[PDB]
Scaffold this active site. Structure first.
Site, PDB file in Angstrom:
ATOM      1  CG  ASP A   1      -9.665   7.280  -0.271  1.00 15.50           C
ATOM      2  OD1 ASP A   1     -10.303   8.299  -0.640  1.00 15.50           O
ATOM      3  OD2 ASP A   1     -10.200   6.185   0.008  1.00 15.50           O
TER       4      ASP A   1
ATOM      5  CD  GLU B   1      -3.338  -0.374   0.256  1.00 19.39           C
ATOM      6  OE1 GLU B   1      -3.449  -1.549   0.674  1.00 19.39           O
ATOM      7  OE2 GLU B   1      -4.004   0.078  -0.709  1.00 19.39           O
TER       8      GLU B   1
END
Ligand SMILES: O=C(CCCN1CCC(O)(c2ccc(Cl)cc2)CC1)c1ccc(F)cc1
Ligand SMILES: CCCCCCCC/C=C\CCCCCCCC(=O)O
Ligand SMILES: CCCCCCCC/C=C\CCCCCCCC(=O)O
Ligand SMILES: CCCCCCCC/C=C\CCCCCCCC(=O)O
Ligand SMILES: CCCCCCCC/C=C\CCCCCCCC(=O)O
Length: 421
Positions: free
Chosen positions: A203, A194
């Site tokens: 995001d 990630e």
């Protein structure tokens, strides 16, 4: 009757299993480890019980009373207590050697250390046993030391419960250490896949997050997004976090992710089925695509439950998930097949065996010291027919240990088959 023949072969299998363990360790450099050196010391205590002590215990079953000198009984009781205490003190040193291996960073120094431990095990075993020869500071013995009321109280505390508490406290500490590292490696795994962010960021799907996919708030308001973060950290986030703080935040995300996995009927069974490391891969997927998203490829999920490691990896590579994030998919799929952190070790498997012998040890002798409590608790006089069975259950542990070595370890297993053939 015929029962005498069973026990002498029990003596024979105890010697059979342990004589193998001693040679097998000294025979192969691959088994010449600190722990395995302490394991032959345990094997020698299990041999001396079978040769020096258990013969007199069988005669006691055959004949039905002592029928020999008082001092012979003192020697027989002293040595019986001494070799069972060596058994316990060896488990204690084994657990401590397992603590050091997982918790500390060692060539000639290991041999000089293990040596010091083994020396402590036997000397202390001896010094603990010497009182039994001199009537537990009670002159005019006039009777086998077994008859002294203090005998069961001395032998139980000094030789069992107190070494039991300490060894149990070590194993707890070992569990805690492995637990911190297991959670450390997970965070480290998803830091690689990630990416770790320490400034608040929008995001993929628009909401402000920080660290490793930790949404502060679905609602977009920057000062309000700081707001939720401030509750988490306690300090003024000011939109700035440490690696450490993110990890603390990350382990919360993992714990939430896991409860949902078990609350998910499609992922509960397969998660329960997998091992610790393979579970970290399955966590990685739910972090990337969500439990509903990971809950897909049930077809692939059945394979991981069926232990089909190679076939789950072949089927996982076929996916769109591979097409979007191939490097990350390949890394995770290896962890599913390999079951190791090589994509992103030795002692965790070895330390699981150590606890396993220390556990069956305890369950084998536990009823024997339970019954002794009941008599000291003045409970209904415990039938001797059972009292004898519990003694042998304790002595059976000498034969089970070499069975456990070959069972849960490939190296003892291969060293064993080489000697026979
Ligand atoms: O000490 C023991 C278990 C009693 C052994 N041992 C059995 C035979 C015995 O019950 C006996 C009966 C009759 C006669 Cl005559 C002599 C001896 C004496 C005690 C022990 C066990 C586990 C451990 F981690 C530490 C110590
Ligand atoms: C002489 C008697 C000694 C008694 C020791 C009792 C030990 C019981 C077994 C295990 C309990 C603690 C967990 C051990 C760590 C295992 C590692 C792991 O799987 O994470
Ligand atoms: C009554 C319970 C006590 C438990 C003791 C069990 C025996 C083994 C334990 C400890 C010995 C440790 C010795 C280590 C010496 C290290 C020296 C060095 O680093 O070279
Ligand atoms: C009642 C339990 C008491 C003993 C606890 C056992 C667990 C740990 C044992 C001892 C600690 C080992 C430390 C060794 C010090 C050596 C120092 C050195 O020489 O460098
Ligand atoms: C009061 C009860 C005592 C309990 C102590 C056991 C719990 C702690 C666990 C393991 C200690 C192992 C220490 C080994 C380190 C060796 C190196 C050193 O001491 O310098």
């Amino acid at each position: 009757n015929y029962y005498a023949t069973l026990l002498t072969l029990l003596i024979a299998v105890i010697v059979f299993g342990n004589v193998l363990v001693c040679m097998a360790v000294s025979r192969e450099k691959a088994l010449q480890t600190t722990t395995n050196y302490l394991i032959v010391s345990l094997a020698v205590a299990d041999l001396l019980v079978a040769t020096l002590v258990m013969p007199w215990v069988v005669y006691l079953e055959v004949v039905g009373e002592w029928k020999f000198s008082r001092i012979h009984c003192d020697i027989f009781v002293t040595l019986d207590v001494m070799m069972c205490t060596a058994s316990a003190l060896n488990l204690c040193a084994i657990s401590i050697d397992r603590y050091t291996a997982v918790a500390m960073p060692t060539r000639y120094s290991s041999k000089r250390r293990v040596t010091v431990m083994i020396s402590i095990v036997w000397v202390l075993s001896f010094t603990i046993s010497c009182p039994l020869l001199f009537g537990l500071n009670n002159a005019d013995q006039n009777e086998c030391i077994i008859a002294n009321p203090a005998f069961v109280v001395y032998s139980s505390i000094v030789s069992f419960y107190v070494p039991f508490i300490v060894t149990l406290l070590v194993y707890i500490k070992i569990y805690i250490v492995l637990r911190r590292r297991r959670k450390r490696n997970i965070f480290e795994m998803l830091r690689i896949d990630e990416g770790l962010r320490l400034k608040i960021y929008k995001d993929t799907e628009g909401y402000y997050t920080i660290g490793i996919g930790h949404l502060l708030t679905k609602s977009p308001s920057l000062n309000a997004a700081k707001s939720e973060l401030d509750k988490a950290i306690g300090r003024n986030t000011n939109g700035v976090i440490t690696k450490d703080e993110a990890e603390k935040l990350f382990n919360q995300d993992v714990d939430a992710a896991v409860r949902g996995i078990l609350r998910n009927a499609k992922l509960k069974p397969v998660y329960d089925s997998l091992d610790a490391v393979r579970r970290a891969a399955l966590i990685n997927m739910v972090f990337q695509m969500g439990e509903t998203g990971v809950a897909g490829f049930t077809n692939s999920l059945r394979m991981l439950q069926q232990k089909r490691w190679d076939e789950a990896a072949v089927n996982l590579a076929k996916s769109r998930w591979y097409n979007q994030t191939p490097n990350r998919a390949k890394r995770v799929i290896t962890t599913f097949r390999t079951g190791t952190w090589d994509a992103y070790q030795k002692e965790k498997k070895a330390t699981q065996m150590a606890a396993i012998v220390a556990g069956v040890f305890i369950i084998c002798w536990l009823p024997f010291f339970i019954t002794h409590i009941l008599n000291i608790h003045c409970d209904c006089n415990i039938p001797p027919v059972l009292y004898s069975a519990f003694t042998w259950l304790g002595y059976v542990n000498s034969a089970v240990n070499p069975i456990i070595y070959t069972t849960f370890n490939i190296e003892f297993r291969k060293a064993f088959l080489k000697i026979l053939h």
